[PDB]
Amino acid sequence: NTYVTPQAFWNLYFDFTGDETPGYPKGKINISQTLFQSEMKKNEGQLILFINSTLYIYNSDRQLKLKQLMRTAPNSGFTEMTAISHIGPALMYLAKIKENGDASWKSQMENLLKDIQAVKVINAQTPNNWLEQVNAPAWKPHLTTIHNMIDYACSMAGNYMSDVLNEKLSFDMASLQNDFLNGNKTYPIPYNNVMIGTFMLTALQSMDQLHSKISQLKIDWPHAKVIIRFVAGSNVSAGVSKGSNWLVPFVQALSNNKLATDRIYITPYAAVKPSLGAQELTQADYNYYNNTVWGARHNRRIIANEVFTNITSIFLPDRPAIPGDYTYSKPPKIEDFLMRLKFSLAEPTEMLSNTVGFWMAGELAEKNWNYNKISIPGITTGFPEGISTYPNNNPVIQR
Amino acid sequence: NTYVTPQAFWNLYFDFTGDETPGYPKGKINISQTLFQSEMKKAQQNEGQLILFINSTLYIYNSDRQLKLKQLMRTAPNSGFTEMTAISHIGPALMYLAKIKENGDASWKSQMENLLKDIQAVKVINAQTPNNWLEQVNAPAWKPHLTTIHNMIDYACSMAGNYMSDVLNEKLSFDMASLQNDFLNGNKTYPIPYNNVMIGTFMLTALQSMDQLHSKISQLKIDWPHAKVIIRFVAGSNVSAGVSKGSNWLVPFVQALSNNKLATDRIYITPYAAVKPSLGAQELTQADYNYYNNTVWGARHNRRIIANEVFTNITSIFLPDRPAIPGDYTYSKPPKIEDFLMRLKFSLAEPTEMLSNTVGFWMAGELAEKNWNYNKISIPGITTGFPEGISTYPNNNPVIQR
Ligand SMILES: [Cl-]
Ligand SMILES: [Cl-]
Ligand SMILES: [Cl-]
What we know:
Two copies of one chain form a homodimer.
Chain A lengths: L6 H7 L17 H11 L5 E6 L1 E5 L5 E6 L8 H8 L1 H13 L4 H20 L6 H4 L9 H23 L7 H9 L9 H25 L9 E6 L16 H8 L9 E3 L16 H25 L26 H13 L7 H13 L33
The complex binds chloride ion (3 copies).
Keywords (chain A): Signal
Protein name (chain A): DUF5624 domain-containing protein
InterPro entries (chain A): DUF5624 (IPR041132)
């Protein structure tokens, strides 16, 4: 076919849109561009940008106020906390490896037990205990509990693995759940509680570090502009909707609910501009995020509602309240977070941090970031009836 | 701080995960890797076609990394897209001009003068005979309604043109409210609302785009139960839309193509997937193929399998899809034009939505019901939805008086 679109059609097309497309006529200012420039002419806020793994905060004068990496610090206690948490999933994986008839489960569990014994010893080191050296102010009220818990965890998991390898217990998905994950006569606090406790401390550390930094900027929250284009490493399908990104309730918490949720836009296809991260954003890069990205989403919402008043408005629901959410259950159950962990792993839309992210953001908001008043499931709450905290003197690992 | 994580903790950490992370000890086989290895003796394989909606184009690649199909789902050159979208966009353009005026920017007058000039040029080119653009464009799905389509663009130009003329000649007021009452809802001279032109034009755009793909994909041998669908589709500058299945009509459209033989869990919306260099080439590089097939598609699918097969002691959660709303095929068996207007308002206000969601969900369902036979389908804003007393768009429409 030799058919060619008449020029009159392109001229009319380019009158409203196409300004970012190659082929757009050089020199033209279309109706969309006029709109995002008219808004500027006739108290402008901060630009909060979660782009990839970094946070960027820029003021009205295009000056950098904060550049923070969302990546976990080497002195945060993340690796330490996560290593203990992962003992549950590791044992689950080993039960599956056994079911598939792969004998490597025995050698992997032997090494896992050996490495847990080395952790028990290092955790018991005094003075200059690793826990006293970690940068986590929010944990300070519970340092003794955190110590006893890692000790309890190593003792429980170690002696459980020992019993499996010495054939005192059976090994399968069912046995693992009843003999270890749910607890036993010697170790009555379920390992399920240790998994949730450790995750919770990791969420609390991450959120406390961010609140400490963002608080010192004295942001005028009612006028803030929030852009979320956050990528969780290789999870290219997660946190692209507000119900599946705990950064949304977390930012609300930071603002003390003074920032309207409609001022928060998840823009996964927004460009990563060249001057992003510089002390000064270029006017072109600033106008891009402020007007082209944030402004366009905000203006469309206003124009549609102000012009189409004769057309009935549709409202779609948010995702339902599910286990792990702050409001779902009070007090929360440990099983609630286990359910959320499974859901977060299976669902492409979810991040593993959603397991506790939504809960901890709500708790910190409710308790106004006061460490002495917050409850931490798996650390301060969720103990079996009759138990108040993790025991101090725990049996040695018998190999 | 001089703090160093104790080695015992790293050793324990690396026993289960970290195999993809830099810093992972050379030679180690962790528990995740053993599970992966053991499951392979018994996960995701190499067979099945890669169906990739990346930016504006659909790419289909076979197991042998060979290109089977490359089609633009929007902005296809000389396809009726630009022509039809240009007319659809007159409504939003005028809405934007009303806001520019409210903000006290006088540039609305010069932008409207030019908009009116360009609508007059389109009216004339649309009236050309013989060799009318509509008779030349490869749009076989439109063939049953060519006369109606012609009269509608003529009507649209005449209505919008004379409306803008009246505003600039101060015969009418111009604001959000006035625009709705005097133009979008219709007027004494032009009784068919411009709202109907917006639905009609959007409908034809959806129909053309979906028909062109069906014609191309039909000629291919696709093993739908084993297909691997990746959606990283971007509706131009709308950087926040179609990032969830309920806000992307490509999801039901692909289900329709598969004749519901493709499982919805095999469809992943991956907005952060990279646009690889050999994408669009006759042959995808082994690195680029392994990226989309294993790094992108495979990992999402493997995590469903790991959760269900390994976390069997944890109760599963089910979340329903979004409810049916006006503009969905499943919503109203005979659809009302009011439904599409409601969906147009919703699509334009909500950052999660694309304007193509106004009709996309409906047209995918209608086409599927009639087994893609466009001679059997009804088209709201073209064949139906006219004000009481009107059957179609008028033929002789007043000239644009500047
Ligand atoms: Cl980054
Ligand atoms: Cl539908
Ligand atoms: Cl009708």
